[PDB]
Design a protein around this motif. Structure first.
Motif, PDB file in Angstrom:
ATOM      1  N   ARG A  18       0.809  -1.220   0.000  1.00 51.62           N
ATOM      2  CA  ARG A  18       0.000   0.000   0.000  1.00 51.62           C
ATOM      3  C   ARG A  18       0.845   1.274   0.000  1.00 51.62           C
ATOM      4  O   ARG A  18       0.384   2.308  -0.519  1.00 51.62           O
ATOM      5  N   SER A  21       1.793   1.938  -3.562  1.00 53.28           N
ATOM      6  CA  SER A  21       0.597   2.403  -4.268  1.00 53.28           C
ATOM      7  C   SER A  21       0.271   3.868  -3.983  1.00 53.28           C
ATOM      8  O   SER A  21      -0.126   4.606  -4.903  1.00 53.28           O
ATOM      9  N   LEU A  22       0.404   4.337  -2.744  1.00 56.10           N
ATOM     10  CA  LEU A  22       0.190   5.744  -2.425  1.00 56.10           C
ATOM     11  C   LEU A  22       1.216   6.647  -3.104  1.00 56.10           C
ATOM     12  O   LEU A  22       0.829   7.639  -3.711  1.00 56.10           O
ATOM     13  N   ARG A  25       0.372   6.955  -6.782  1.00 58.49           N
ATOM     14  CA  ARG A  25      -0.755   7.857  -6.979  1.00 58.49           C
ATOM     15  C   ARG A  25      -0.346   9.337  -6.911  1.00 58.49           C
ATOM     16  O   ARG A  25      -0.791  10.131  -7.753  1.00 58.49           O
ATOM     17  N   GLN A  46      -2.045  13.469   6.295  1.00 63.40           N
ATOM     18  CA  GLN A  46      -2.956  12.573   5.601  1.00 63.40           C
ATOM     19  C   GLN A  46      -4.394  12.730   6.072  1.00 63.40           C
ATOM     20  O   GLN A  46      -5.323  12.814   5.262  1.00 63.40           O
ATOM     21  N   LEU A  47      -4.622  12.802   7.381  1.00 66.09           N
ATOM     22  CA  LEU A  47      -5.955  12.776   7.966  1.00 66.09           C
ATOM     23  C   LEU A  47      -6.622  14.150   7.906  1.00 66.09           C
ATOM     24  O   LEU A  47      -7.852  14.302   7.971  1.00 66.09           O
ATOM     25  N   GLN A  50      -9.016  13.946   5.108  1.00 63.73           N
ATOM     26  CA  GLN A  50     -10.269  13.324   5.482  1.00 63.73           C
ATOM     27  C   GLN A  50     -11.072  14.172   6.466  1.00 63.73           C
ATOM     28  O   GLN A  50     -12.292  14.297   6.373  1.00 63.73           O
ATOM     29  N   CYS A  51     -10.436  14.766   7.490  1.00 65.71           N
ATOM     30  CA  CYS A  51     -11.015  14.652   8.848  1.00 65.71           C
ATOM     31  C   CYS A  51     -10.969  15.983   9.586  1.00 65.71           C
ATOM     32  O   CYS A  51     -11.843  16.251  10.422  1.00 65.71           O
ATOM     33  N   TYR A 187      -7.915  11.679  19.808  1.00 72.04           N
ATOM     34  CA  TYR A 187      -8.744  10.556  20.266  1.00 72.04           C
ATOM     35  C   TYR A 187      -7.897   9.405  20.777  1.00 72.04           C
ATOM     36  O   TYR A 187      -8.358   8.644  21.636  1.00 72.04           O
ATOM     37  N   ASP A 188      -6.676   9.231  20.291  1.00 71.36           N
ATOM     38  CA  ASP A 188      -5.750   8.259  20.881  1.00 71.36           C
ATOM     39  C   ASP A 188      -4.514   8.922  21.432  1.00 71.36           C
ATOM     40  O   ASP A 188      -3.430   8.349  21.575  1.00 71.36           O
ATOM     41  N   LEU A 190      -2.574  11.052  20.097  1.00 72.28           N
ATOM     42  CA  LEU A 190      -1.568  11.308  19.077  1.00 72.28           C
ATOM     43  C   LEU A 190      -2.200  11.909  17.814  1.00 72.28           C
ATOM     44  O   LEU A 190      -1.760  12.973  17.337  1.00 72.28           O
TER      45      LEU A 190
ATOM     46  N   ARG B  18       0.419   5.257  25.173  1.00 72.26           N
ATOM     47  CA  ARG B  18      -0.943   5.580  24.743  1.00 72.26           C
ATOM     48  C   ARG B  18      -1.866   4.362  24.727  1.00 72.26           C
ATOM     49  O   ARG B  18      -3.087   4.523  24.913  1.00 72.26           O
ATOM     50  N   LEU B  22      -5.520   4.209  26.659  1.00 74.21           N
ATOM     51  CA  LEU B  22      -6.796   3.861  26.045  1.00 74.21           C
ATOM     52  C   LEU B  22      -7.498   2.728  26.787  1.00 74.21           C
ATOM     53  O   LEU B  22      -8.682   2.853  27.083  1.00 74.21           O
ATOM     54  N   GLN B  46     -12.325   1.655  15.784  1.00 73.01           N
ATOM     55  CA  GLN B  46     -11.947   2.929  16.372  1.00 73.01           C
ATOM     56  C   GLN B  46     -12.395   4.113  15.527  1.00 73.01           C
ATOM     57  O   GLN B  46     -12.954   5.087  16.042  1.00 73.01           O
ATOM     58  N   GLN B  50     -15.124   8.122  15.032  1.00 77.60           N
ATOM     59  CA  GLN B  50     -14.825   9.423  14.470  1.00 77.60           C
ATOM     60  C   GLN B  50     -15.590   9.688  13.174  1.00 77.60           C
ATOM     61  O   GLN B  50     -16.088  10.786  12.926  1.00 77.60           O
ATOM     62  N   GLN B 139      -4.311  -2.088  -3.079  1.00 79.34           N
ATOM     63  CA  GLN B 139      -4.908  -1.545  -4.301  1.00 79.34           C
ATOM     64  C   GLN B 139      -5.174  -2.630  -5.345  1.00 79.34           C
ATOM     65  O   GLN B 139      -6.166  -2.555  -6.073  1.00 79.34           O
ATOM     66  N   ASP B 188      -6.195   4.827   2.085  1.00 77.44           N
ATOM     67  CA  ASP B 188      -4.876   4.203   1.941  1.00 77.44           C
ATOM     68  C   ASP B 188      -4.980   2.736   1.614  1.00 77.44           C
ATOM     69  O   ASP B 188      -4.096   1.910   1.862  1.00 77.44           O
ATOM     70  N   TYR B 189      -6.090   2.316   0.992  1.00 79.59           N
ATOM     71  CA  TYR B 189      -6.378   0.948   0.594  1.00 79.59           C
ATOM     72  C   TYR B 189      -6.431  -0.020   1.784  1.00 79.59           C
ATOM     73  O   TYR B 189      -6.293  -1.250   1.590  1.00 79.59           O
TER      74      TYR B 189
END
Lengths: 212, 212
Positions: A18, A21-22, A25, A46-47, A50-51, A187-188, A190, B18, B22, B46, B50, B139, B188-189
């Protein structure tokens, strides 16, 4: 060799490919697009795509997001040398990496970040470089908090004399006066929640608009 | 010993603690709350909290989310034995784990999942147990796709005679006819985007309402 500034890909020891593959891309993204701003780093970059909402603040600026979870400084350096800066001419490159360099001293991580800034200055010499500070981590005080603090000190002092390189501390005060980080922000302890990303991205977006 | 069914915590080789922070938070959750449904597993559990919206579909059902990124079967077993099933009496426990058991054969991962179902049957014998299938990853076609397929086959056949244990394949067809998984479903597949979570959670929520 500083391990942190010797460029190398992530070896696949799991078997689904993976990481490569990233990288492939992102290489095609650079072949086919014309960004004004390129973002690169570990899961904090990265997040954000998304987020946080990337779309409100950073999509308008004509931006590509090349974050990969788990990357150290040396993996980012390798990706920038092996296709992800080809065919493009960004005004700004944003770098955010170093919290995952486990087994490297704070001095070595700093050398890693400096080698990334130098490569970007060689391959894309028109671009300003923004480097973000490493965030605090862990629910309570711990040695990685002190490590990441020392990296930020050494990187800030390295870049201070750098006309088109900018250090940004984007931390709003995640560590409270009792020493704790709250899982509402991370949330974790980190990775940033949606709520944790808002003030980080706010600070970044303001700097970007100022430079742009 | 099957390594996958010998209970053990994640050792901290990084230094911010961490994982244990948790686990201790989830232990306090169980001390202080009275869930009807408990979710436990790796990052697929997890991030559902979110990054799907948990709040529309699962919050109403009185649910706790005990997902931790990176966990294998044996780490989930340990957490359920060491505080996270205390003080509560759920109707349903949802298990989703096994894709991260690298270095274990598909047969060993299956033994891990079966030991989790048995522990839940001993400690919380009133509860139904839902186990989700391991999703495809990478992928392109690769050996971890075949591994995860074989785990799902062996787990489905293990649970088939189990009056209150339910296997669910929640995969809508992420692998397309050209063999590819799209980064729109899994950025990220491996980890699901918001879009990728919708049909997964839809399938789970329907089963849950049926059982409840």
């Amino acid at each position: 060799e500083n391990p942190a500034s010797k460029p190398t890909p992530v070896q696949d020891v799991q078997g689904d490919g993976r990481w490569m593959s990233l990288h492939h891309r992102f290489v095609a993204d650079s072949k086919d697009k014309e960004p004004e701003v390129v973002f690169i780093g570990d899961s904090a970059v990265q997040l954000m795509h998304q987020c946080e909402i990337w779309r409100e603040l950073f999509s308008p600026l004509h931006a590509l997001n090349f974050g990969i979870g788990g990357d150290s400084t040396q993996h980012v350096l390798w990706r920038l040398e092996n296709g992800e800066l080809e065919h493009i001419r960004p005004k700004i490159v944003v770098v955010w990496v170093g919290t995952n360099n486990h087994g490297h001293t704070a001095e070595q991580v700093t050398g890693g970040i400096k080698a990334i800034v130098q490569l970007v200055n060689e391959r894309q010499p028109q671009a300003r470089v923004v480097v973000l500070g490493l965030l605090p981590r862990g629910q309570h005080p711990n040695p990685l908090r002190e490590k990441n603090r020392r990296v930020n000190e050494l990187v800030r002092a390295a870049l201070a004399g750098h006309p088109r390189a900018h250090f940004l501390d984007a931390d709003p005060g995640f560590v409270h006066s009792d020493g704790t980080i709250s899982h509402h922000d991370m949330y974790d302890y980190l990775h940033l929640s949606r709520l944790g990303y808002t003030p980080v991205c706010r600070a970044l977006h303001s700097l970007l608009l100022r430079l742009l």
